[PDB]
Write a protein that binds this DNA or RNA. Structure first.
Ligand SMILES: [Mg+2]
Ligand SMILES: [Mg+2]
Ligand SMILES: [Mg+2]
Ligand SMILES: [Mg+2]
Ligand SMILES: [Mg+2]
Ligand SMILES: [Mg+2]
Ligand SMILES: [Mg+2]
Ligand SMILES: [Mg+2]
Ligand SMILES: [Mg+2]
Ligand SMILES: [Mg+2]
Ligand SMILES: [Mg+2]
Ligand SMILES: [Mg+2]
Ligand SMILES: [Mg+2]
Ligand SMILES: [Mg+2]
Ligand SMILES: [Mg+2]
Ligand SMILES: [Mg+2]
Ligand SMILES: [Mg+2]
Ligand SMILES: [Mg+2]
Ligand SMILES: [Mg+2]
Ligand SMILES: [Mg+2]
Ligand SMILES: [Mg+2]
Ligand SMILES: [Mg+2]
Ligand SMILES: [Mg+2]
Ligand SMILES: [Mg+2]
Ligand SMILES: [Mg+2]
Ligand SMILES: [Mg+2]
Ligand SMILES: [Mg+2]
Ligand SMILES: [Mg+2]
Ligand SMILES: [Mg+2]
Ligand SMILES: [Mg+2]
Ligand SMILES: [Mg+2]
Ligand SMILES: [Mg+2]
Ligand SMILES: [Mg+2]
Ligand SMILES: [Mg+2]
Ligand SMILES: [Mg+2]
Ligand SMILES: [Mg+2]
Ligand SMILES: [Mg+2]
Ligand SMILES: [Mg+2]
Ligand SMILES: [Mg+2]
Ligand SMILES: [Mg+2]
Ligand SMILES: [Mg+2]
Ligand SMILES: [Mg+2]
Ligand SMILES: [Mg+2]
Ligand SMILES: [Mg+2]
Ligand SMILES: [Mg+2]
Ligand SMILES: [Mg+2]
Ligand SMILES: [Mg+2]
Ligand SMILES: [Mg+2]
Ligand SMILES: [Mg+2]
Ligand SMILES: [Mg+2]
Ligand SMILES: [Mg+2]
Ligand SMILES: [Zn+2]
Lengths: 83, 100, 99, 211, 127, 151, 114, 224
RNA sequence: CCGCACAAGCGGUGGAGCAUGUGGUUUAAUUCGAUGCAACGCGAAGAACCUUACCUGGUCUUGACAUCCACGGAAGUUUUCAGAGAUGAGAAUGUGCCUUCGGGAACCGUGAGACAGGUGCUGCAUGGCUGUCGUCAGCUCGUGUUGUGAAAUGUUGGGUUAAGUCCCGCAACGAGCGCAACCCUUAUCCUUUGUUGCCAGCGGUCCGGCCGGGAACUCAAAGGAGACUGCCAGUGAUAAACUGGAGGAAGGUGGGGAUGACGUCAAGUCAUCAUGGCCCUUACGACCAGGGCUACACACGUGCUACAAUGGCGCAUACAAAGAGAAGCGACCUCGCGAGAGCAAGCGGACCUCAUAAAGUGCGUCGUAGUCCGGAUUGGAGUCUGCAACUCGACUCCAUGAAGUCGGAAUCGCUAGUAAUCGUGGAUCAGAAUGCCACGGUGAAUACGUUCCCGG
């Protein structure tokens, strides 16, 4: 947890671009590398392609995932089992 | 270490002691008790706007004449190997092999 | 009112020489003096790996001993406080004065 | 079996420090970097002047460098000029008023550093190593040294199998802390790689501590 | 009137002042029974008195600093012994027979590089 | 102990009673250098043993201890290239130490939801020549003199 | 004694008997007893049934017993349904708080399956 | 020395007839009680002619080395050398004492350095244990070279008691050409002695007779 | 014949959970190195970004870092847009400094080549440094002597010692590198100086060395004394030495450390650094964001916490040492159940702060059970550091309460203030210790002996 003294954290570029997208209407998925940004309620209904080290996984933002970070919904390692 | 690593270190030192006052006041505003929520919010954005390499926590202490990033000693500014070299040559004042 | 002087050194013979000189000029210039009254010697210690790779267990221990001396003169006549500042001593001795 | 550095193990017993200033924990590393740069510059600019030692003191707000050399005239230069020329750049490097004193080594063949650098200079001018070794040892023993060991190591004669050859003459007791042993090393960069020379010179046991 | 003795154990130091008149024992402005909550310390602090058979003829004023309870008890015993010797100087032979002038030099051994303790070597495996 | 066979250290006599053997006992059951705890357990156990015995704690302890002191024990030896399980007679201080160790061990493994209680219980038992400590002394003697061939 | 927690607390002291309810630890039990005016070392016996009631209505001020188990179940399903990292780790049965998995992650995996 | 002077001291006495050496037959009077009897008729003139040579050597500033390692007669030979200002070996003979002269000189120098150092000082600078150890080494060096510290160079003449016991010394001397004067019991081989005195070498009385007569003639040769 | 090598002992490891390292497997990458003892809490004295060398993608090509040359600009300072960021495109100031007044030195940008750059290969080309046998007692030489000579002697023999330590014997006599000693620390006393340390006798007290005062004592840190088989007895070649005793704070190199001979293993390190050769040069170099080094069917090593009553829990209450502190240590007071927060004193520190040591002791409780044992795991809610705690930080509160009831074969450590147990501090460090390096508290058992095991 970050703090209650401070506010939840978000990358400035991501904030500006998601506000542009939400005011201009739904569009293509917003590409971002900001795995460390908190999902704000003004981002529900959007689709954000979050980087995972090599490829932008598209995550469709739901109501229930508000408050979590984007990187939580784009795993970086691949296991697939040991066979 | 490579010359590029020492170059990165000196550039980080310069950027950290160039933006020290602005980062200080922004962090003060953010951690300020009873600060305006909008003022605290804009300070968070402004702080994340500054160059990433301006935070002192991004500096890595390196041995001052080889650049080694491990085994650093703050009292001397050198790694363990160069500390031992200068100590045995009698180039560190007072330092001598101890036994008790 | 008084003058309190702290001497710091890395070697104790040098600090003994310096404090003897200080107390001797003070006694010569008419001031009343307190003796060296040595404060506890601070021995800072370091332990470093003598082996560049693999052998962490092989290592040696070094220490810097800094010796303290305290000289207090209770009657700092202007005949004396000047001669104090005029006095210069060895290089490896730190001198700190307070009134 | 590895051996302790014979100079460092006698520090404060029979051997003095090469830096004799005092500093707190906030200007200590700065002082080490400063006088490392000073020593580096002085060894670079004086490689031909046969410099043996560089002592560095730091009085209240100054720096004093004593250069123990074997050829004082070359260091000073004519009219006493080159000494001032290097004094001003030492003051630039240290960022503080500087002084330069010069102490002459009256017998160079008894100083470990001078013997070692002479041997290395003869080595990188492709002189046969055993010749220089024997000549150094005999010159030292002739001028009243009570013992000397000279060891040259690493690809001698330009071979493909590096080996270490040493030669001792006299009494060189390394386990006696009371013994006054001058010890130094040097490196020769021949066309077949680097060659390491070590010199121990025993000058008699000293009775009565540092005094 | 007074007779003084200093005693030392592992890291403790005890100043002991003896005078004649009673069997009072004070340790750091506290009675013996309320400074040493151990019967072993209580009996080892008055061994010299019971040995020389002067238990109720001497008032003891003690000041002990450093160490633990056993160290302080032993330092006070050594100090009482030395003060008794300064008191009569003929009790020395019996006190030495009891071994109270021993001043044992045992001290906590220092930790050493490569070991986990003064002598405890780390565990070792081959296969 | 290959060159100079080293002697034994001198425990100073017990604080409360004055028995050096009781001092050896309290040293023997002391765990983790915790002297006072074992000392209190021993003092409490001896007093409880004394009330049933009607005898002085030192004597009842002595009669219980001698009732456990073995006189012969087995030893693994090599003299003629054989795993010689030789019965050999014991020394006095060795049999004292073995008796104390055996009674401490039996007490520790009895439990009785206490320490002083179980110690006093089995000390009173070994006093009347019964219990696991006595059982183990008889078992040692049996193992020893079941192989009388090597005497 | 049968508290609002449908289980049956033991015969031991109250302060620890109340910890048998799924959702009550030591601190919550102390708080309940202090709210009901009952001493901690009093056994579960010698308590008039009125006191059992005046502690049942107190423990009723917490979500303990079955309701807590349902709350834990739905909060885990939240993660297992969102698709977050914690959800996938709850699904695969692996430590969800960043512990190493190269060795000794057994309590999340059970006995070793060679 | 007169035959009567020797005979009372017992010079005629010898070793057992069981233990004799072949070349000694000319010097043997006969046997009694299975004991070899030495003939004083040969002993006296040979000793006198040897005393002549010893007087000559000492009268040309000769350095004389008295040699004997018998535990009974060590002090007698030492005092004998002191009575004529000469050099001696009374402790067990060291091989190469004459042939390895250079090594002895280093040992002589070390003995001189330790005694000079103690007089000069610096023993206070040495640790009390170290100073005592240096004194012990000085004592050991003196017990080893008390007689020859002042010999300076190789001696000009050797006097040997029981030449068979000291055979290494005579072998060295012959290898150096240094003359050997020796009291030769019947069990000894007389080849190595250029001026041979056949006589008892154990008996304290006869040994002291030899030493006293030699020392009197050596002082006489010195006096001139 | 020696060594915790075995034996005699005490406590472990091997079973459990967790921490950590390695192998393996997986992966876009899981960077590289270390591999029987002598690799495996190792290089790393501390990977969220940084570090970072690895991966994906975006970018640069005399370059991130150095000198040189030409051309054009003072340097720097405050902003806007685009971009994940590297980087691109955008305004007023400045016009400083020095001038034979050209210009220069500083710095900036562009252009052109010499070049830079490489944590790229080789530790079977090297220096340096280190491990290891092993603090094991050895390794040799000069001269002499013996032998045609290769060589031998010394260095073997008899005793003795921790020791090639020492004494006898002996063609050996000596010396060198080692052994020992010199050094550090510790145990007693003395002398000197008494602050910020001390408080015996004194007066004054708010009962606080707190304040007059005291220089005694503890202590602080300089100097010096002291232990030498010196003394006694006995054994022993009358020797070396051994055994015991006296005195003594200390007795037989008092305890501990530092100190590691000639050499061994082509042992380790080209990734600290340096370096021969080779290799790369719009890339194997350089910049940036995100990811990885933290994976997880398993195997091994080193640890931590446990399985409890010699204990757990609550209340009360004693006794340490050694350290650190200026972008630092941070009191008191207030707020919060708490991690902490707010205000803010003092301290470059025998003064102030970290900072109440915990085992212990007293009183009460639990009564042998998977428990008032154990704490894993997990849910919820928080604090702090930091641009930023998703991958992947530590800590707190509430809840949850796995395994575990003493561990097979086998194996490790330790001979005294030692093992065991109990806390404390420090280095690295914004934050991140169960590791490492130090400190003190409590405090044992046993050693008949050298037959065996391992090593010399
Ligand atoms: Mg959380
Ligand atoms: Mg480089
Ligand atoms: Mg960092
Ligand atoms: Mg300090
Ligand atoms: Mg070493
Ligand atoms: Mg809880
Ligand atoms: Mg983790
Ligand atoms: Mg066991
Ligand atoms: Mg296992
Ligand atoms: Mg295990
Ligand atoms: Mg792998
Ligand atoms: Mg690896
Ligand atoms: Mg380790
Ligand atoms: Mg790329
Ligand atoms: Mg360009
Ligand atoms: Mg290059
Ligand atoms: Mg290269
Ligand atoms: Mg190698
Ligand atoms: Mg040894
Ligand atoms: Mg060997
Ligand atoms: Mg031997
Ligand atoms: Mg040999
Ligand atoms: Mg030989
Ligand atoms: Mg022998
Ligand atoms: Mg020797
Ligand atoms: Mg011999
Ligand atoms: Mg030594
Ligand atoms: Mg002290
Ligand atoms: Mg005062
Ligand atoms: Mg002193
Ligand atoms: Mg001694
Ligand atoms: Mg005695
Ligand atoms: Mg004695
Ligand atoms: Mg010692
Ligand atoms: Mg290795
Ligand atoms: Mg990066
Ligand atoms: Mg444990
Ligand atoms: Mg514990
Ligand atoms: Mg710290
Ligand atoms: Mg406080
Ligand atoms: Mg509060
Ligand atoms: Mg705070
Ligand atoms: Mg702390
Ligand atoms: Mg308690
Ligand atoms: Mg519990
Ligand atoms: Mg439970
Ligand atoms: Mg041992
Ligand atoms: Mg601990
Ligand atoms: Mg810690
Ligand atoms: Mg300890
Ligand atoms: Mg063997
Ligand atoms: Zn004869």
């Amino acid at each position: 947890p970050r703090s209650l003294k401070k506010g939840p954290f978000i990358d400035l570029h991501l904030l500006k671009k998601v506000e542009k997208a939400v005011e201009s209407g739904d569009k293509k998925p917003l590409r971002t590398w900001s795995r460390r940004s908190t999902i704000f309620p003004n981002m529900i209904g959007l689709t954000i392609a979050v980087h995972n080290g090599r490829q932008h996984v598209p995550v469709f933002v739901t109501d229930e995932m508000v408050g979590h970070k984007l990187g939580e919904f784009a795993p970086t390692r691949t296991y697939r089992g040991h066979a | 270490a490579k010359q590029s690593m020492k170059a990165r270190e000196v550039k980080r030192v310069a950027l950290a002691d160039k933006y020290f006052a602005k980062r200080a006041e922004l962090k003060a505003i953010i951690s300020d008790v009873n600060a305006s929520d909008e003022d605290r919010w804009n300070a968070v954005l402004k702080l994340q706007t500054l160059p990433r390499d301006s935070s002192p926590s991004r500096q890595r202490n390196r041995c001052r004449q080889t650049g080694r990033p491990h085994g650093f000693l703050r009292k001397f500014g050198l790694s363990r190997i160069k500390v031992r070299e200068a100590a045995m040559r009698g180039e560190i004042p007072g330092l001598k092999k101890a036994s008790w | 009112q008084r003058i309190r002087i702290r001497l710091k050194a890395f070697d104790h013979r040098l600090i003994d020489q310096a404090t003897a000189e200080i107390v001797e000029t003070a006694k010569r210039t008419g001031a009343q003096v307190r003796g060296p009254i040595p404060l506890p010697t601070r021995k800072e210690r370091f332990t470093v790996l003598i082996s560049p790779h693999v052998n962490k267990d092989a290592r040696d221990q070094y220490e810097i001993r800094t010796h303290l001396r305290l000289v207090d003169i209770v009657e700092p006549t202007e005949k004396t406080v000047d001669a104090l500042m005029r006095l210069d001593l060895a290089a490896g001795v730190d001198v700190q004065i307070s009134l | 079996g590895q051996k302790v550095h014979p100079n460092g193990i006698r520090l404060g017993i029979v051997k003095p420090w090469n830096s004799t200033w005092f500093a707190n924990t906030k200007e200590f590393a700065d002082n080490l970097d400063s006088d490392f740069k000073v020593r580096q510059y002085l060894t670079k600019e004086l490689a031909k002047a046969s410099v043996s030692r560089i002592v560095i003191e730091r009085p209240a707000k100054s720096i004093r460098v004593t250069i123990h050399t074997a050829r004082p005239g070359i260091v000073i230069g004519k009219k006493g000029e080159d000494v001032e020329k290097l004094r001003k750049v030492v003051a630039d490097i240290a960022g503080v008023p500087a002084q330069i004193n010069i102490a002459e080594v009256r017998k160079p063949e008894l100083d470990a550093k001078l013997v070692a650098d002479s041997i290395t200079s003869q080595l990188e001018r492709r002189v046969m190593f055993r010749r220089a070794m024997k000549r150094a040892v005999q010159n030292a023993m002739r001028l009243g040294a009570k013992g000397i060991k000279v060891e040259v190591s690493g690809r001698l004669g330009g071979a493909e199998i590096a080996r270490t050859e040493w030669y001792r003459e006299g009494r060189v007791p390394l386990h006696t802390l009371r013994a006054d042993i001058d010890y130094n090393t040097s490196e020769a960069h021949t066309t077949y790689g680097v060659i390491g020379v070590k010199v121990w010179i025993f000058k008699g046991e000293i009775l009565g501590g540092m005094a | 009137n007074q007779y003084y003795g200093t005693g030392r154990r592992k890291s403790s130091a005890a100043r002991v002042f003896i005078k004649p008149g009673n069997g009072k024992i004070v340790i750091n402005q506290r009675s013996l029974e309320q400074y040493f909550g151990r019967e072993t310390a209580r009996m080892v602090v008055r061994q010299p008195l019971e040995l020389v058979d002067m238990v109720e003829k001497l008032d003891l004023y003690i000041t002990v600093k450093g160490g633990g309870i056993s160290g302080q008890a032993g330092a006070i015993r050594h100090g009482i012994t030395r003060a008794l010797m300064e008191y009569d100087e003929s009790l020395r032979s019996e006190l030495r027979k009891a071994g109270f002038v021993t001043r044992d030099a045992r001290q906590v051994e220092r930790k050493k590089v490569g070991l986990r303790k003064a002598r405890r070597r780390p565990q070792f495996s081959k296969r | 102990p290959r060159r100079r066979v080293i002697g034994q250290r001198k425990i100073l006599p017990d604080p409360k009673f004055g028995s050096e053997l009781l001092a050896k006992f309290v040293n023997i059951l002391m765990v983790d250098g915790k002297k006072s705890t074992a000392e209190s357990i021993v003092y409490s156990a001896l007093e409880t043993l004394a009330q049933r015995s009607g005898k002085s704690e030192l004597e009842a302890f002595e009669v219980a201890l001698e009732n456990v002191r073995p006189t012969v024990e087995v030893k693994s030896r090599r003299v003629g290239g054989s795993t010689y399980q030789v019965p050999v007679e014991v020394r006095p201080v060795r049999r004292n130490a073995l008796a104390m160790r055996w009674i401490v061990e039996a007490a520790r493994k009895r439990g009785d939801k206490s320490m002083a209680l179980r110690l006093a219980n089995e000390l009173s038992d070994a006093a009347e020549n019964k219990g696991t400590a006595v059982k183990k002394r008889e078992d040692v003697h049996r193992m020893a003199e079941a192989n009388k061939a090597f005497a | 004694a049968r508290i609002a927690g449908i289980n049956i607390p033991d015969h031991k002291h109250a302060v620890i008997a109340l910890t048998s309810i799924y959702g009550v630890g030591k601190t919550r039990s102390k708080a309940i007893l202090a709210a009901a005016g009952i001493a901690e070392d009093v056994k579960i016996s010698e308590l008039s049934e009125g006191q059992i009631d005046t502690l049942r209505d107190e423990v009723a001020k917490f979500v303990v017993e079955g309701d807590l188990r349902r709350e834990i179940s739905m909060s885990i399903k939240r993660l297992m349904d969102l698709g977050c990292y914690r959800g996938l780790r709850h699904r695969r049965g692996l430590p969800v708080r960043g512990q190493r998995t190269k060795t000794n992650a057994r309590t999340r995996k059970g006995p070793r399956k060679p | 020395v007169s035959m009567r002077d020797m005979l009372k001291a017992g010079v005629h006495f010898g070793h057992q007839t069981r233990y004799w050496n072949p070349k000694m037959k000319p010097f043997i009077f006969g046997a009694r009680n299975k004991v070899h009897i030495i003939n004083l008729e040969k002993t006296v003139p040979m000793f006198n002619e040897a005393l002549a040579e010893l007087n000559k050597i000492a009268s040309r500033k000769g350095k004389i080395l008295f040699v004997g390692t018998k535990r009974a007669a060590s002090e007698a030979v030492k005092d004998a050398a002191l009575s004529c200002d000469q050099f001696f070996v009374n402790h067990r003979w060291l091989g190469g004492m004459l042939t390895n002269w250079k090594t002895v000189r280093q040992s002589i120098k070390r003995l001189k350095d330790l005694e000079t150092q103690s007089q000069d000082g610096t023993f206070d600078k040495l640790t009390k244990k170290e100073a005592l150890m240096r004194t012990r080494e000085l004592e050991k060096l003196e017990n080893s070279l008390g007689g020859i510290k002042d010999m300076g160079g190789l001696p000009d003449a050797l006097f040997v008691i029981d030449a068979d016991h000291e055979h290494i010394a005579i072998k060295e001397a012959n290898n150096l050409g240094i003359p050997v004067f020796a009291i030769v019991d019947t069990n000894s081989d007389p080849d190595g002695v250029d001026f041979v005195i056949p006589g008892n070498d154990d008996a304290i009385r006869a040994v002291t007779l030899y030493l006293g007569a030699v020392a009197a003639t050596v002082r006489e040769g010195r006096s001139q």
